[PDB]
Amino acid sequence: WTATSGSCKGRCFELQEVGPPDCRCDNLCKSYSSCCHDFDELCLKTARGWECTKDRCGEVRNEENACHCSEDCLSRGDCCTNYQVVCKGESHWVDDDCEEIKVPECPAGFVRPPLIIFSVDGFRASYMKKGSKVMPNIEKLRSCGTHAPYMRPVYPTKTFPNLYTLATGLYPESHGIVGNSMYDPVFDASFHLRGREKFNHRWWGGQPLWITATKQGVRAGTFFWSVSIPHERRILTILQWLSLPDNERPSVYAFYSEQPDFSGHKYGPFGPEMTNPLREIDKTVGQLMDGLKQLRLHRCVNVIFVGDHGMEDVTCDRTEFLSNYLTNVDDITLVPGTLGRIRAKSINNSKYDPKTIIAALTCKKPDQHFKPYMKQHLPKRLHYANNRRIEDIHLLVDRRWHVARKPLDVYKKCFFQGDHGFDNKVNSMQTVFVGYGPTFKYRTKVPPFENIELYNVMCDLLGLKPAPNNGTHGSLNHLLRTNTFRPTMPDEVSRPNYPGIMYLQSEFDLGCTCDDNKLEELNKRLHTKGSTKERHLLYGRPAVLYRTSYDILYHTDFESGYSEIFLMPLWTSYTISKQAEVSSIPEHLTNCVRPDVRVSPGFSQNCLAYKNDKQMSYGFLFPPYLSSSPEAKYDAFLVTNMVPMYPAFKRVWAYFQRVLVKKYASERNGVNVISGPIFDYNYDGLRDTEDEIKQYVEGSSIPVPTHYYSIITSCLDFTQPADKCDGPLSVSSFILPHRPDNDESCNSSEDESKWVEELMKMHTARVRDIEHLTGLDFYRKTSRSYSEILTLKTYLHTYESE
Ligand SMILES: *[C@@H]1O[C@H](CO)[C@@H](O[C@@H]2O[C@H](CO)[C@@H](O[C@@H]3O[C@H](CO[C@H]4O[C@H](CO)[C@@H](O)[C@H](O[C@H]5O[C@H](CO)[C@@H](O)[C@H](O)[C@@H]5O[C@H]5O[C@H](CO)[C@@H](O)[C@H](O)[C@@H]5O)[C@@H]4O)[C@@H](O)[C@H](O[C@H]4O[C@H](CO)[C@@H](O)[C@H](O)[C@@H]4O[C@H]4O[C@H](CO)[C@@H](O)[C@H](O)[C@@H]4O)[C@@H]3O)[C@H](O)[C@H]2NC(C)=O)[C@H](O)[C@H]1NC(C)=O
Ligand SMILES: O=C(Nc1ccccc1)c1ccc(-c2cn(Cc3ccccc3)c3ncccc23)c([N+](=O)[O-])c1
Ligand SMILES: [Ca+2]
Ligand SMILES: [Ca+2]
Ligand SMILES: [Cl-]
Ligand code: NA
Ligand code: NA
Ligand SMILES: [Zn+2]
């Protein structure tokens, strides 16, 4: 109950929202059915529309009008945004040449440049070029300011997850808004776009920018607008707040537009009906910039023009139905559409079984347009698992498609021609970023980056300390003229041991066997002391950022950091030049595993465990195929280079090591490779401690990795070889799931050349993802600036076309 018979007189769009049952006048009162009786009349004025005309110039103030063209309007802060143009012979902001903003040019009393976030729903990245003829204001922001060719959304590429990721710097799994629709089993409550439960604060985790600001003494305009408040009024409200006295004026504001998304759903991303919505958004930007200029704030405010996700062509006929796969369709609840999430209809049904549901959805039709996953098997780059609100069974749906439970769901719910929600690597889901103002760079293009990074930068723009988040603070320093954040490298926590020869062959009883000169005996000794190390360890050794016990092991062809706790390398580093040759494993060495006399039997793996474990086989981190000489090849068979591998995974690994590394070395002019194991049994994206390992090689303390990574580095200038590179680096990485079957790849019974590379591409990763997963910190010794290295570590190679 609201006693809606109070009044909004002098309270219109008040910044502090008042406590029930007193009636509200804030920009969300409408959404809560709680505005005072006179809110429309006083606050949502519309008389005479939104623009000054010649005949209104110098009029007598009529308080009924939507905006004013009277003489006192500048001092009142409530002129129509085109007042000065119509009535004072001023030019529109868009018709002015752009001029570098070297320093903020702000009215007296401004403590810092204000930040205005202009967010547009469904603004696909290619709109910038394809709609450029009809978006002159946006194109001026873009060309004069700092812009990226696109910005990567988070998964799922829906509205609520992405806007809240913008506001927090957190993955949906950590902020809790994991879709537009959700069930939380602890609350036993549901969250929907329509309705009331979404207003409950217990859904919304992390700390959004407006709270970060408030807590640190920076005032914030309210970021949300009820849908029925028109755009022109949102802008006028913002411009009015900007006229408040110094002590009451916010420093951060957000505008939100539901366009072009709303139209895109109806007409497709490029439907001829889409030109008008883009025209109208541009007009709104025009109104803001003309209003800023009137207030002399156009060379003072930083403006961010940012989308939440793109939009793809999707029609009702491109719907796969679970009823064409499942006999038990009525025992499941599906969250449908551009992604699938499946749970049991009833928790009292103990005959519901996820294993058989997944199997019934796996590779059943030759052109199947979705792929089922247990959530923990999804590509790590999606970071979509560590939340009770994300169902165990997930469907990644092909771009352009929908998944639904039964055909009745679709035609008793063709309406739509566009949708979004797909994998955040998909080109059509990419969205936009432009920054314009004193704190951004002038006429600068920056590479594409992820939207999880923006919260840090918005905090920098406002002089705030960001709450803990998933951005990498400093990776977007290149966007900024000043206010950069100067990060330092994390301190190494554990220093390595450097063991020499300490054990005799006969002290080992591992059940391993192998069939195995003064010039070349000083030679082998120097290699084991680290003579070739500057060749194979190009960027310094990775730092270990947790407490552990490990050894550096040097060899002719590779260097490793060997964990005495996990009984295998944390990392193995090696360089393959363009000229290197692939050889095979000689017949007499096929099953060769050799004790490592630098490492105690007690801290080694044993061959007996693998013999006994009928499920588990083994692989090598440094590939024997790429040994530099028949004699160096013996190093590759050391028990300290060995890692546990399912036979099904060995097909993947062997193809990567035998074929792909050489291919990349040819294409990239040498590559440096760092590979290793990852353990993430609780799928939180973070390195497991030993007591978290759920699986071991049978009868042993050899822990089974959940994933294997590789980081592949070369020179960005591919005319220079990887090992002699004078400038910026180029990287691609992956985190391959360590699985006992290849069910994920529907083509796996074919030659590895038909499916393996496709799988690796799907599991492409950022170096930063691998950092979280291993507690390692890479690129410690380069000639590059740290901010540049941070940008490199956030890079994702996506394998989409242009
Ligand atoms: C992306 O960035 C984020 C943010 O930096 C990273 O997430 C952080 O990771 C930390 C490590 O996992 C985690 O730290 C833990 O916090 C516990 C206290 O948590 C509360 O307080 C914080 C701070 O205000 C708050 O943010 C939390 O909010 C979560 O939970 C509420 C409701 O449940 C949600 O509204 C909200 O969305 C958020 O949920 C998300 O995080 C939680 C984990 O906290 C997940 O479970 C959810 O699924 C969801 O993703 C909380 O309100 C603290 O209690 C923990 O301490 C335990 O572990 C330590 C290890 O040092 C141990 O020493 C302690 O003894 C303690 O153990 C005890 O509890 C155990 C569990 O019950 C039990 O097993 C033991 O036996 C002990 O009794 C821990 O320090 C931090 O909270 C989150 N923050 C956020 C915002 O998510 C994230 O990792 C980054 N991702 C990547 C890939 O890098
Ligand atoms: O209009 C809408 N839906 C809709 C309903 C009916 C018809 C058509 C569209 C609609 C949809 C979303 C939002 C929204 C704004 N912010 C704040 C914000 C965050 C980051 C950067 C800018 C701003 C959010 N933060 C988290 C989640 C959602 C939102 C609003 N909103 O303004 O509150 C309205
Ligand atoms: Ca949206
Ligand atoms: Ca973990
Ligand atoms: Cl959803
Ligand atoms: Na075995
Ligand atoms: Na298969
Ligand atoms: Zn939408």
Rounded distance between C-alpha atoms, residue 38 and residue 35, angstroms: 8
Question: What DSSP line would sit under 172-191, residue for residue?
Answer: HHHHS--SSSEEETTTTEEE
CA distance 645 to 274: 52
SS3 assignment, position 79: strand
Contact 234, 225 (CB under 8 A): yes
Query: 647: cis peptide before it, omega within 30°?
Result: no
Burial class of 501 by CB neighbour count within 10 A (0 to 12, 13 to 18, 19+) = exposed
- Please tell me the distance from the alpha carbon of residue 171 to that of residue 152, in angstroms, as a whole number: 13
CA 396/CA 361 separation, integer angstroms: 12
DSSP E strand stretches across 529-656: 543-544, 550-554, 559-563, 568-576, 617-620, 642-645
Residue 774 · residue 570 · CB < 8 Å: yes
Evaluate whether 699 touches 676 at the Cβ level (below 8 Å).
no
For residue 749, how far is its CA from the centre of ligand 7 (angstroms)?
A: 6
CATH number of the domain to which 606 belongs: 3.40.570.10
Check if the beta carbon of residue 595 is closer than 8 Å to that of residue 510: yes
| Residue keyed to tokens 């068979």 | 637
Asked if 398 contacts 762 with a C-beta cutoff of 8 angstroms, the reply is: no
Residues flagged as binding site for 1-hexadecanoyl-sn-glycero-3-phosphate: 159, 180, 261, 420
Residue 195 DSSP one-character state: S
| Two tokens, residue 28 | 């969300």
- Alpha carbons within 13 angstroms on the beta-carbon side of residue 612 total 13
Taking the CA of residue 119 as reference, the ligand 2 atom at the shortest distance is 22
- DSSP secondary-structure letter at 658? I
Q: What is the DSSP letter of 543?
A: E
Header resolution in angstroms: 1.9
Closest protein CA for atom 3 of ligand 1: 469
Strands 449-450 and 764-765: unpaired
DSSP 421: -
| Active-site residue flag, 146 | no
CA distances from 232 to 80, 258, 328 (A): 10, 13, 51
Q: Experimental method for this entry? A: X-ray
Angle among Cα 697, 699, 700 to the nearest 5 degrees reads: 60
Q: What's the gap in Å between 679 CA and the centre of ligand 6?
A: 20
Asked if residues 489 and 567 have their Cβ atoms less than 8 Å apart, the reply is no
CA distance 239 to 292: 7
Pairing of strands 146-152, 449-450: parallel
Number of the ligand closest to the Cα of 680: 4
- Annotated binding-site ranges: 121, 159, 180, 261, 265, 308-309, 420, 680, 682, 684, 686, 688
Q: First CA to last CA across the chain, in angstroms? A: 55
Query: Residue 595's domain spans which residues?
Result: 505-794
Region of 442 please: left (phi>0), alpha (psi -120 to 50) or beta.
beta
Tokens 């900007």 map to which residue? 242
Task: Evaluate the omega torsion of the peptide bond into residue 272 and state whether it is cis, within 30 degrees of 0.
Answer: no
Please calculate the CA angle 106-108-109 and round it to the nearest 5 degrees. Answer: 105
Per-residue tokens: 464: 């705030």
Q: What is the DSSP string of 690-732?
A: GGG---BSTTSS-BPPSEEEEEEEEESSTTS-GGG--S-EEEE
Residue to mutate (ligand 2; options 256, 304, 431, 459; most atoms within 8 A of CB): 256
Closest CA to 224 of 24, 398, 50, 19: 24
- Cβ < 6 A, ligand 1 pocket: 170-171, 173-176, 205-206, 383, 386-387, 468-470, 684-686, 772
Distance CA 635, CA 285 (A): 64
Q: Which amino acid is at 238?
A: I
